[PDB]
Amino acid sequence: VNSFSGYLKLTDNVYIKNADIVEEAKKVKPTVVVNAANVYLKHGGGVAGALNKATNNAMQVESDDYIATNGPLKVGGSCVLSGHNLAKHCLHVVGPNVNKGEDIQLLKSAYENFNQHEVLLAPLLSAGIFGADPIHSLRVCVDTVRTNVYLAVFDKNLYDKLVSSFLE
């Protein structure tokens, strides 16, 4: 049903909220939730671990079956799997891990996958343990994505920094 509420307009197609993406997916019933995935679709922590836990491991069993046919995803790549109870679809996107020397230029490739979907609930890609500056990730999102993206940012202090950087 895509019932987004309380998102702050950044651009005509990019919105942002200080919120837990799991709690957003339950209220909003989005067509697409984006997972910040790794190449093995092993949902061990961060957003991936939170989304998988909210599906009581249904997402991990589906992900394993995909990886059995595909082998690992490419950095910058994605797959569309079931959203289970969270969404119609989950778009698993792999952003570069700059800690492992993956090139930050691949973050544009990662966000380009969003353009296959009219409306997405998403986190910022390559943040947290993938080591990219989240404000940089937001700039790449805004420059790359032309479909309607609703960004959820968990941490209030990071959210305020993102909105300050973008609107001040």
Ligand SMILES: Nc1nc2ccccc2c(=O)[nH]1
């Ligand atoms: N519930 C929950 N939400 C998150 C959102 C972003 C990153 C991490 C998390 C997390 O670890 N748990």
